[PDB]
Ligand binder design. Structure first.
Ligand SMILES: [Zn+2]
Ligand SMILES: [Zn+2]
Length: 85
């Protein structure tokens, strides 16, 4: 038998950001442009996470529904296992 673990984190670490983060970070993109471009109203509307509100990507790009209230980034959403399988 043995004991001893090593793992710490930085609590309350939200680096302020003057400019709004609008960099498509979704899993799959359909917009021909597939860039940080969005409209005021439409599927291609820049959507910011709800939990932390840091990530920013299109609507249909984040594989969401046409009747979704708010969307949350990955790190926030319950993703079984780390992105890097
Ligand atoms: Zn996108
Ligand atoms: Zn988030």
């Amino acid at each position: 038998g043995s004991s001893g673990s090593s793992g710490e984190l930085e609590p309350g670490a939200f680096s302020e950001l003057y400019q709004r983060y609008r960099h498509c970070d979704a899993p799959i993109c359909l917009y021909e442009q597939g860039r940080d471009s969005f409209e005021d109203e439409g599927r291609w509307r820049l959507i910011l996470c709800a939990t932390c509100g840091s990530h920013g990507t299109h609507r249909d790009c984040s594989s969401l529904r046409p009747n979704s209230k708010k969307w949350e980034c990955n790190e926030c959403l319950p993703a079984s296992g780390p992105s890097s399988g």
